[PDB]
Each structure stands twice: as structure tokens, then as C-alpha cells.
Symmetry: D3
Subunit: 306 residues, 6 copies
């Protein structure tokens, strides 16, 4: 391998997602920060070892890549593609840099975010900042366990990391982010059994519904994709609840990593545009995407050498 960033993190219960745009003239300041971001991760995190589990994954957008870097582009990097479905829309929103910061406690996330943004002041403009927290039994804001079918170990490495198909960028990955807000009032008007039909798994025990009962427009049915090879196409998700009680914002911050964006984009087309047997993913009847961006997260060595 070249050394990947910490895309495959242990379970962490806190996150900060920071998305910024690079102002005109900001490119040199950004390049300096990229070359120091691993040492800032160690400076904030080392003293909290081994419990802290602080990591920062840094992603670069398609248009930003062109402004920052001389030569070859990762093969799969392009701007997030808007999906204009008959009912639901996946919007594309601006984002040049993503900082996906995770730890076992929010203070470490905040301290590293503070240091990063300290160095970028005056060169970037914030577009989104989300402080995420996991519910205690890995549940999301709809009350379902979230993460169960993620790949593990070698299967995860194979699904997420660029390899010999794009060898200059081996050890990188592609991240898609979407901020979702939920209509909790509508969702809580459904019976548990109806909610289970939307997701495709049992609510309390997290057991998958059998094939003879699982609806075609359930979330699990539409995000299960088989390749030309007969095998399952997989992504790695680390979705985080977030919100504000006073503003009635109850949200899921979606982030999905894959070795090529084609996998993630196929899942999204199935959700928003539907299939022969399904108009769209029923989860979107209770979830509105308000952001959407695509980033390439290079190997750690790529960033160190700038």
C-alpha cells in the first residue's frame, strides 16, 4: 500500500463535518495547510491516546483539485451530479474541501477543527458545519440501527480504497456527503410495522425482513446493488445524527466512501429515480437532502508531500 487516511476508523461517537470553499487567492494557504493536517491531527490527538481515537479525513472537490494541483486527476473525480427525480431531488451544493473529523468525544473534534480553521482564516469561506453524535445503541434519528451491513476488514479495504485501476491515486477513496433533514412528525405517525416496511429491517431487533415480505421500494432493497460479476457492490457509511430541538431540526448527515463514485451514484439513482418495480426509496418521503457534494480523499502520503 501507500498509506491511506483513516477512512476505516473504529467506531466513534462524535463527529464534526466541515465543508468550505476556497476564496480566490486562497490556494497557497490551503496547500500549506494540507501538508500539515496530519501533524495537527497528532498534536491534538496524541495526548488523548488511546481512548480519544481522533482522526481527520480530508477531501478535495473536483473544481478545487484543478485549482490546487499541477498534473493528473483521479479518474472518478467530477462534481456531484444533481438528480431530478419525478418526486424527490438530490441537490448539488458547493464544497471544495471536506474535513471529516471523528473521535470518542466532541471536544477533540472541536479542538482539531479550531486549529485547521485557524490556519485557513481569510482563505476559505465556511459552507456547512455539523456536530454529530451517535445514539447509544447505534441508532439514527428515525430510531433504526444504522451501520449494520457495513463491510468489515478486508472486504471494507477492497470496497473503499483505490488500487491498481488508478495507481497514481492508490490508497485514496471517494466520499459523497448529503445533509438530510427529517419530517419526524410524519414518521412518528406511522406504526412500527409501516416504518419497518420503509427501511426493510425490524426496528427493535435489527433483523432483515425476509425476501418474501421486504418491499421493493424499501431503503434496503433499493441500496442493494449487484455488479456485472454477480457479487454485491458495497460502500462504507458513517451516518451521524445531528440537530437542534428549538428549531425542530432532526437530521442525518450521510457520508459514504467507495473506491469509485459509480457505486454510490448508482445507489443514489435507484433511490431518487427509482427502478422498474419502485418509484423511489420510501425513506425520501421522510427525508429531504439539503446538501450534496463529492470529494476525493487522497492517500496520506500524497498530502504530506506538497
Amino acid at each position: 500500500e501507500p498509506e491511506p487516511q483513516m477512512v476505516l476508523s473504529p467506531l466513534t461517537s462524535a463527529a464534526i463535518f466541515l465543508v468550505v470553499t476556497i476564496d480566490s487567492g486562497g490556494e497557497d494557504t490551503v496547500r500549506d495547510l494540507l501538508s500539515d493536517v496530519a501533524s495537527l491531527e497528532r498534536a491534538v490527538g496524541f495526548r488523548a491516546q488511546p481512548d480519544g481515537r481522533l482522526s481527520c479525513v480530508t477531501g478535495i472537490g473536483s473544481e478545487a483539485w484543478d485549482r490546487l494541483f499541477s498534473g493528473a486527476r483521479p479518474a472518478g473525480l467530477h462534481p456531484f451530479r444533481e438528480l431530478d427525480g419525478p418526486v424527490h431531488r438530490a441537490v448539488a451544493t458547493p464544497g471544495d474541501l471536506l474535513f471529516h473529523i471523528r473521535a470518542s468525544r466532541l471536544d477533540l473534534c472541536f479542538a482539531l477543527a479550531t486549529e485547521i480553521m485557524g490556519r485557513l482564516r481569510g482563505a476559505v469561506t465556511p459552507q456547512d458545519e455539523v456536530h454529530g453524535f451517535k445514539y447509544f445503541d447505534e441508532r439514527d434519528m428515525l430510531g433504526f440501527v444504522d451501520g449494520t451491513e457495513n463491510p468489515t476488514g478486508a472486504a471494507a479495504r477492497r470496497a473503499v480504497l483505490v488500487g491498481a485501476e488508478d495507481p497514481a491515486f492508490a490508497g485514496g477513496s471517494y466520499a459523497v456527503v448529503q445533509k438530510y433533514l427529517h419530517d419526524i412528525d410524519a414518521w412518528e405517525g406511522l406504526s412500527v410495522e409501516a416504518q419497518e416496511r420503509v427501511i426493510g429491517r425490524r426496528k427493535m431487533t435489527d433483523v432483515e425482513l425476509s425476501d418474501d415480505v421486504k418491499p421493493a421500494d424499501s431503503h434496503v432493497a433499493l441500496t442493494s446493488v449487484t455488479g456485472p460479476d454477480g457479487s454485491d457492490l458495497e460502500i462504507l457509511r458513517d451516518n451521524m445524527p445531528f440537530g437542534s430541538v428549538g428549531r425542530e431540526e432532526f437530521g442525518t448527515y450521510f457520508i459514504g466512501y467507495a473506491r469509485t463514485p459509480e457505486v454510490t451514484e448508482t445507489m443514489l439513482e435507484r433511490m431518487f429515480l427509482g427502478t422498474a418495480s419502485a418509484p423511489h426509496d420510501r425513506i425520501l418521503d421522510f427525508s429531504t437532502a439539503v446538501t450534496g457534494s463529492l470529494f476525493f480523499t487522497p492517500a496520506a502520503d500524497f498530502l504530506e508531500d506538497l
Copy 2:
């Protein structure tokens, strides 16, 4: 004894502070929720025992008290008093109800806040919502250990709980809240030694500066007050950092509990108005108060039985 609310909580690393006003017509909804708030605390918290340490302290303001209840008022209950000092101002901002929610994890705080506000929908208007997190060494946003000299055990009970001086309301307490925003750029331009002179304690080791070196306008000097008998008057604090890196908000949410507000108000007068030997508390040269409210937090029995 009457049973107090959990004013004396173990150390907790997450908090939500929620301040609301009661809309016209909302009184009955509020009264029903007050009588169930302890059972909601158990419902959300029990399943995460014993680690969760979830508690909710509920407080009621002076004007709200008159709307909700007839009969006796707590003796010390009045609206927060604005302090218009020569340089610094402590503002008074609206607030009828305070929910001070603490736990070892933010998700438990959020779940209980969701249930409370779900019951109050349409009866209240949010005025402030802060999600606080402790730094890993009990440090605040200025980098100093925060909480060291709080009383514990019997001394804490005696300092915070109403007793025989107002026997109908024994087991209650008075809470003062202020949200502070910091000028971190200015603060970080001071040397550590200069910062220690502002606070009155050593930064790294948290040892109090000796009397011959501690300035009269240091925070510790001005918030040390002795009563008629030569003994120290004490409060119980549970200050929490909060912020947003994109908006450059770095904050301390102050909350102080005492058996009478006179103690807390004396400290505030010294800080903001100054004394013969100190113009004002030097901490205020790096900290701006943007809210200020006073609440009475009744004994748990009072809330149950109405």
C-alpha cells in the same frame, strides 16, 4: 428532608441548556409537563444506567411564577438585574423556564430535550439552546481548569439548597445563567503569565496564585466573598464550553446555583461594577455576556404534586 432536583450532579461531560418563554394560553401545557418531567428523566435515562448520569434541573422565572402558581413566592425570586457598569454590561434577557440537562453523552441530553419540547410544542417559544461539551482536562475555552473550587458534600448542600429561612421552598435553589462569548484572538495574544494574572490561578498546574501576587482585579479575587461571620460565601458552578468554528463563536455558558441569589448577585456586582481597589474583573475584557436570567429550581416534590 424534601427531595431536591439533581442540582448536585456528578461531573458530566455534556449538557443542553434550554431557555424558553411561555406563550399566552400555554400555562396549562407547561403545568402538565412540569408534573411529568421527573418521569421523563427516568424514561430516557434508566436504560443507559449507570454510565449515562442523565439529569434535568427545571427552573422557573419570576414573571412566569406569577402566571403559573398562586400562593407563596420563593423569597429571593425576582427578575435578573441588569448591571450597567462603567465599561462592561451584564444584560437581562427574557426567560420563563430553564431546562439544565446533563449527562455523560450528548445523545441522552438530546433525547430528553426532544421529549420535553415535544410536549411543549405550541405553548412556548425558544429563546436559547446551547449544546455544551467539556474539554478533556475539565478545561474551559480559555484553557484553564474550571470548577476546582466548587464546594462538595455537606458544604455544597449548605451553599445551594434553601432551608429553614424559607421553609415552604426548602430543597430548592436559585440558578443564574449567562451566555458568554470570548475574544480568543485577544486572549491568545497574552503570555501565559499574563493570563494567569487575569484568572488568579496557574494555568498548567491549577495552583492558586499566592495572596502577595494575585491581583485585586483577577477573577478569583473578585469572586471571593466573605459573609458577616468571616466564612466564605460559596456557589456551585457547572460552566460548559460551546461554540461553532465556522462562525468563530467560542463560548462559556455560565450557570451558578446558590441558596439565595444575593451571593451570586454580589459576585456579579464586583465583577461588572468594580470595587474601590478593582475597576472590574479582567476576565470581562475577553468575555461578553449576551444573555442573563434568574430562575428558581424547586424541590422535586413541589413539581410532582401540582
Copy 3:
């Protein structure tokens, strides 16, 4: 003065319940063991501190009391009273001694149970032995959080420990046990909403149903009792799941402590015999009691002599 047994235990995730009868001639062996049981608790448990949280509460039944001791009896001690309801029955089964052993791990429970039974070999006959395990989010075998409305702190002391009303036995408590087996197939055929109507609380979030929607024959409705002065009568429970997948046994081991058995017995009458507005507790349509016994758990000093 008097030091209670560890009736008010922290949360523990494992338990052994051991119920035995005292054979003819076994009384002296039992009395010797009773005077050592606290030192055995420390011998097994001290070295596992502070995580182990091992405790043993020892209880004595009404007929056994008369065999072991003379002089005063605790005022409330009597044999468990069978309830023959129109549909459901609460049976009374034999039991002279109860050992309620709790810890954070089953091995510690087993080690202490081994030492106790080692000393009693030849003097007692086992009637029941159950190895209990709590589910990770304090849920029981029916999938509901179990323990939520137990009293804590001073309210628990006042609800569970004998005081001035029976001063020779102050610091004791009364334990009722029942082993329940559940019909899981029937239970799992209910919707979540229907299950919530049986219990009286929401399944996922454990919030109580409001008074206007909570059925009168729900478990929470029928086990809520007010005394003459309008205040709530409370007990302290530490129900444990148990079972065997091969034998299709899925169970709840009920144990309830109270300062007088009258409180517990009133709750049982409401559950099994009903009220004006409820035929019986709906939980009994999925739960069958196969044991029932009542014990007095004396203050620890009483056993030390």
C-alpha cells in the same frame, strides 16, 4: 443500629436464584451457614472489587422460621397465598431458604453459590436454581425496559426496610419470588402498539403512556397502588430473564422486596383477580407463574448471631 443485607444493590447483570428446603435434622447445619454467609460473600467477592459487585441476600420462609428460631417472628411473615383467579392462578410452591446472588458476572455468582451449597450438602434439598442474565439495555424477555420506576435513595429505604413498626426486625425486608414462563410465539404475534397496551409504556423509548390512552388492564395500571393517604405504595424489583433455547423456555424470574408483604400481595391480587374495570393483568395472557414463595430477609446483624 442495624445493618441491612444488600437488598438495595447497584445494577447487576447476572444473578443466581437458589431456593431450597431444609431436610429433617438439617437445622443446625443451616444455622451454622447462616452465621457465616456474609463472610463467604466477602471471601469470594473482595478480590474481584470494585467491578464484581457480588452480593448475596438470604431469606427465610415462614415454616422454616419456626424450625430454626424461637421467640419473636417478623410480623408479616406467612406462607405465600395461592391466588385462584377466574382465568389465571398464582401457585404457592415449597421453599425454606432463598439465596439471591447478584454480580456483574455469572462466574462470581456461581463461585459463591458453590461455597454455600458446599456447606449445606446433606442438610437441604434444592427446589429451584435459575441463572439469570439481563439484556444489554436493561430489557427483559418481552423486549421492554424493566426496572424504570423502581424507587431509589431514601424512597427505596422507606419502601423496602422494616422500621419502627416491628423494631426487633428493623433493617429486614420481605421478598416475594415467582418464576414466570412466557409464550414468546404468542407475544411476538402482537404489533408493537398492542404490546405497549399490555405493558403501559412505549417499547423503544420507555415513556409511560398518558392516562387518557393507558388501558386499565395494562401491567403498569394494575401495579400502581395508592395507600389510604393518597401516596404511592412502592416495591423494589430486580426481575431477571432466564432460559434454555433447546427446551423452548423463555422466562422472567420475578423478585420483589417490600417493607411489608401487604403491598406486594395487593399488587398480585389486582393482577390475578382483577378490579372493577379490569378482569386481570394482560401480561398474564403471555406469562405463567410456575413457582411462588415468600421470605423474610433479616438484617445482616441478625444472621451474624
Copy 4:
């Protein structure tokens, strides 16, 4: 690689061992369950991460293999061989399927066992169910540390997983189970020094007795086997105490995994039939085997693909 099942588990303190036979006509129900058992493991276990450490290893017996599958058999799969020694006997008892379920808590084991047996109701007959619990300092029912000389890391992989010698079944393993009941009264009548001579290690400190003093009929002496090439032959064990105090049952559930059964079978021959210098393993004078079965535990991918 093919992905093995979780044969190499971290240390776990609870286990359920389930052995069943497949009834007439049960094969289709069994095959459906085998293809879902990994997803049931994730459903029950994921929400209890990372503490839960729940895993399930599934094994299939010799006769069962031929009912369930056609095509190739694993090279070493055969029925457990009875050893009818001069004094001690290793019995064979029926078993078609083994579920070896491990976790940090018994409730998780029980939850997974419930789901598995729920799917098999009416297709299988239970033969054994044991609920195992480790003592707090990794001791067994005889009071000795149990596990010390198990191989770890690469050496464990090499000792336990089928490789190139049987390439269609690479990543599988062979499990032998025997339920032992102990005569605790006899064992406790020995002095500690006498017990140490039976095992071959010091009781309190777990230091191996030196070669000059360790008896030839000690457990450690007889279960140390060198292969023709001079190297040590190793197995991976995860022995678990179990019992019932009322019934006076105090037991060790032996389970041993190896890349070929010949290793485990050689150890058993030495124990039960003896060597030139040793009549039999002295541990058998305090331990009686009441079950005995042999299973092949295939690679996880083999089961997924049915």
C-alpha cells in the same frame, strides 16, 4: 483470500454451545439458515459494539455434510473416533451442526441462539446446550489458568486454517468438542503441589514446571506433540466452565480447533491410550467425557453462497 469465520476470536467471557441433529426432511430449512447466519450475527451484535464481541462459528458433521451438499468433501472430515482406553473412554455422541457462540455477556449469546433456533424449529433435534462462563482470572473449574499456551497471530492462523493442502476448503477449520464433568471432591482433596503435578504448571503463578520435574503423565506433557519435521503441533482451544450447583455438576466444555483433525486426534490418543512412559493423562482421573463430536467449520463465503 477467502474470509474465515471468527475462529480466532478475542478473549470472551461467555459462550453458548449448541449441538443439534437434522431431522428427516430438515435439510432445506438448514441450508436457508446457514446462508443467513452471518447476517443474524451482525443483526444481534452490531448494536452492542464495540464491547459485545459477539460471534458465531458454525460447524457441520461428516454425515450431515453428505445430506446438505454435493460435490467435494473436506479431506479430513469423518465421524469422531471413539477411544476405548484401558481405564478411560472418549465417547462419540451424535451431532450434525455445531453453533459455538461467544460474547462478552451471556445475554448476547442467548439472543443469537434464540434467533438461530427460531429458524430451525421443526427441522432439528437438540442434543446439547451448554451455557459457559469464564472465571475472572481466566481460570477453569479446576482452578488453573486455561488458555496460556494457545498460539496467537500468524502462528494461530497457520495452526487452525485449512490452506493449500485442500484448496477448495481453504479458510475452514476442524473443531472437536467434548463435554467433561469433574469430580471436584476428589480434586480438592489433593494438595496444590499434587494438582500442579497433574497439570504440569504452577497453580498461582501459571509458570510451567521445568522439564526435569514435570511428570510424563501430566496434561501438558502428554498434549505437547512434535511433528515429523521437529516443529510443535498446535491447536486453538477455548475451554469453558459450566455447571449447576443444585445438581452437583461442575464441568469443562472442551473445544479445540485445528487445520487438520489428525493433530487433535493425536493429542486425544496420548491422553486416553497413553504412551510408552505414561498410562494416561492424569487429568482424566478427575474428568469424565460424556459427549464427543467432530465438525468442519467452513469459510464464511462458503456459507454465504448457498
Copy 5:
């Protein structure tokens, strides 16, 4: 009314014992430090709450008391009494102040010791400094569990804290310290059963030997004392192992607290001078006392008010 020092500490796994003498002219420096030692405990310890469990118990010797204070002496305060037995001797060694520092980690103990000695250098001379550590499952250097029969809860308060018999000093306690070195070679030449006869309990399981078998010169037999009224006389011990492998020092640091020194001194007389049935405590055939001192540990408010 009066607040004791933290004599009744939870279990802690590290300790520092510091014994010093007060130099001529050092009395004022010592008195200033005594009035600040609680503040220093908070300064070092607060930031590690709630896990740190740092406490310092401060004790004052008989001759030192007369140098530091005038007015009343505690009734039981006198210099440690040498016991010159036929075989074994309990020596009296100098000591004016004791600092018994405990925590869950050594660094906190060391940090507090550093602050205390920083204030006292030039006023005191160190006589003994021991760094103690917990050894396995509450075992001492002889391999036995140590602390099992300590009193707990109310019984501990009644055994350890001065009350109405000496009301000016209520809430204080008396501490006896003796540093013991062990002859490990001799001890390890005994069989386990012989060691159990020295101590009076079983080694592995820590079960007390029955009255039928417990020798009269066992440690447990000689340290069990009943008062005139038939009740047990109890002390609270927190013995700590210490040592150095290269110097062959394997030690037990004995510390025992009691409401009057007569209880502790009776136990010592039984051990060193014997009874009608026992020449001396057999533990002394493997344990040599090289220090011995007695201190009064005043209530915390006594020290605060100087």
C-alpha cells in the same frame, strides 16, 4: 458538624507514603502548609475527576503536636511504643508528619507529593518514602488477598473516627504505620497448606479456615480481638506492596486506622509478645518491621482553620 479527612477512601491502586521530621525552626512553614493541603489536593486532583480518586490524609506525631499547637492534645496521642518480644521486635522510628497519598494512578500521587514537599523543603527532613502498588487481585507480596475483613460503611465510621469520647477532636483518627520487609525465599519454601496455616485463610479462594483447624498462632487468630462487651474490635487497613527486584526488597507497607490507638496496640502486643497459647504471630517469621510510628489525623476543618 465536623468533616473528616478521606480516611475511608474507596479502593485505590497506587499510594505514596511520606514520613518526615520537622527541623528546628520549621514549625511556621509546616503550619502554613497544613492549612493549604486540602487546596493542593483539589488543585492536583480536580482535573482528573472522577476517575483519579486522589486524596491525602495528613497525620501529626505526638512530639510534633506539642511543637505546632497549644491547647488540647487528642487523648490517645503518644509516641509509638517499641515492643521488645522474646524473638521479634517492633521498632519505633522518628516521624513528625505523615502524608498518606492515594489515587487510581501513581502520577497523581507523585504530583501532589511534589507540591507538598516543594512548600516544605528547608523545613522538614524526609525519613521514609514508599511508592506502593496493588498486586493482582488485591494480593500482597505473600500471595494472599489483603483487606478482606476490613469494616465497611457504618461499621467502618464507628471503628475509625473519634467521636463523643474526645469531642474537641471528633472526626479525627489515629494511624499506625510499619514498613515490613519479607523473606520471600523462606516463604516460598513452604507448601501452600503451610502458608495457609501461617495466615489463617485459604490462599486461592480467600476462605477463612474453620475454628476446628485454624492455628492459635496464625495471623488471623492473633489479630481477632473481642472487647469486654463481647463485640469485635476492628481497624481499617490499607496495606500496600512495594519493592525493588535488584535489591531483593519485597515489602508490605502496613497502615492501620482506628478511633483509639489501644485497639491497634493490642493487636500488635498479641503479634509480637504472644498469648498463653501462641508465642508470636507466625507471619513475623517471614516479615521484619523496619519502621514504626503513630500519628493523629485531625478532622479536615481543624487543618483549614490555622
Copy 6:
């Protein structure tokens, strides 16, 4: 070849034991070396997985020649004394090193007891230090210590002998120095002055920028690049130790590297200085009182003796 546990997880306790081999002690030593891994498992297994007990064993240059014949590791020599204009790095005797680490001191002490028990009468102790982690990975100067250590594959590549010395692949070279600090002098500096000595910020552990980091700061002098532009790295696991009564406050330095050339270059820069720096400022507050070099062989080398 399997290396010893040079790359350990973070551990909060250590014992460092340095001994010399007495005349005639060689065979006793060789027998112990072949059992040291077994002893590590025996003491450690029962505390897994929290214990994290490990022992790295090293052999000095003169000792190697007494114990073994044939080929020697290419870089093995006695520690080289550095006589700088102001500061001196002394060389002190040491034939064997036992670097014992765990999450608790008792495990370290138990293993050290067993090892020294086997060597009684064959070795003489030279140094014994019981180290403890201080707060949030701080050292006795109050700075975080460990931050820039390599991790993962970069660590393996920096510390383990490979194809450059193939007979000894999987080994490493350990340099030890016991340092005592003059804390009174150090505490007379302002925080900003202390930061200029180390080259990082005290509270936040952020490296000073290149425009403000002095040339004689510790971080500046211990940053070394090879001819090909790459960083030359070592693995450190420095441990505080001390005694408050004697006013001894120390750092026990241990540095592992695939060749002693890397470590020795750093030492020369610290003690003898460069074109732009007289010496490492940290040495104005730190005195070395021991210095030894050891080769830590691959685990299989020791097993096969």
C-alpha cells in the same frame, strides 16, 4: 522472522532493568534467554487483554562476544561517550537490558521478579527504574512526549533490521540514557522560553513554525534527513521516574532504531552541536547519568538457544 515486541501499544508503566553478567554466569543467562517469552506469557496471559505486558530483551556488545560465537550484528558496539564543550554523554556498564512494559506496574514487577529469580548469582544489577506515565503523556518538564514517533509501517521500517544485515533481520538497536532534570532551574523560565527550548507549544503540543523555532531547540536538533531527502526516524518510549524526598525528577530515555547510526547522529547533534547551534538547550536542564547500547534480537533467535 518474528521480532520482539519493540512496537508496543502505549503502556502506562515500565520497569527498566540493566544488569552485568558475572564471571561464569553465561550459561545461566543463555538458559533464561530461551525461556523469557514463556515467562512473559505465564505472567501476562491471565490479565489479557488489558494487561499489555511485554518484555524486550537486549544484549550489549561485550556480552554478545561472551555468550555467542560466529557472526555479530553489523552495528553492535559499546555506547560512544560524547565529550562536548559543555555537556557530556557518559557510557556506563550494561550487558543485558530488560525493557518491561504494561498497563499496570504489578505485571511489570511480577515478570521482573521471575527473570531476576532465574538469574540470581549470575548477574549484578546496575540500574532499576520504575517508570510511570504522567498525566496526558507528559514528561517531567511538562511537555507531551511521544507525539512525533512513527507509527505503523513507517515505524516497522525505522526500527527493524532487514536485508542490510540479513542474518539478524527482525532485530533492533536500543539506546538508553537515564536523565535527571534540574526542575528549579527549568521552572524559573517562562512558558514561552520553555517552548523555545523544546520547539513545540506547551499546552497544545503544536510544533512552532519554522520561522520561530530556534536552531538549538530539541526538535530542531533531533530532526535529521538522510542523503535522499527522507526523514531518519527512531521510536522512543521515554518514561518519567523519580523520588520526591531526594528531589530526583527524571526522564528515562529509550530509543529504538534499525541501525545505531541514526540514534548516534541525533546524540552528536545534541551534545556536540552544529554549525548554527552550540548544543541542545534541553541539556541545560537535563544531565545524563547512564548510557548503554543494546541489540534486541528477533524473538526466534532467543527461542532457539
